[PDB]
């Protein structure tokens, strides 16, 4: 169960890093 969790958490880290980059780009595209 911990080895499986480690792999799910690594997959989440890679998806969140990306979303952060895509959201940063969208924020620039949309503007203020």
């Amino acid at each position: 169960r911990v080895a499986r969790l480690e792999k799910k958490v690594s997959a989440l880290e890679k998806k969140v890093a990306x979303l952060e980059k895509e959201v940063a780009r969208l924020k620039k595209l949309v503007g203020e």
Copy 2:
């Protein structure tokens, strides 16, 4: 401890999935 972590990870997966879908839709609306 591991059961509680499994619950937290499943909740994060459900939030990341969605964010991915919302981001995809926003990308289309910006012209990518």
Copy 3:
């Protein structure tokens, strides 16, 4: 290993909370 996963999951939770705030703003500006 368990403490290391708890650290990583906490970090992810605070990055996903945010992404949800910034995606909520983008969706409001583009949608309305």
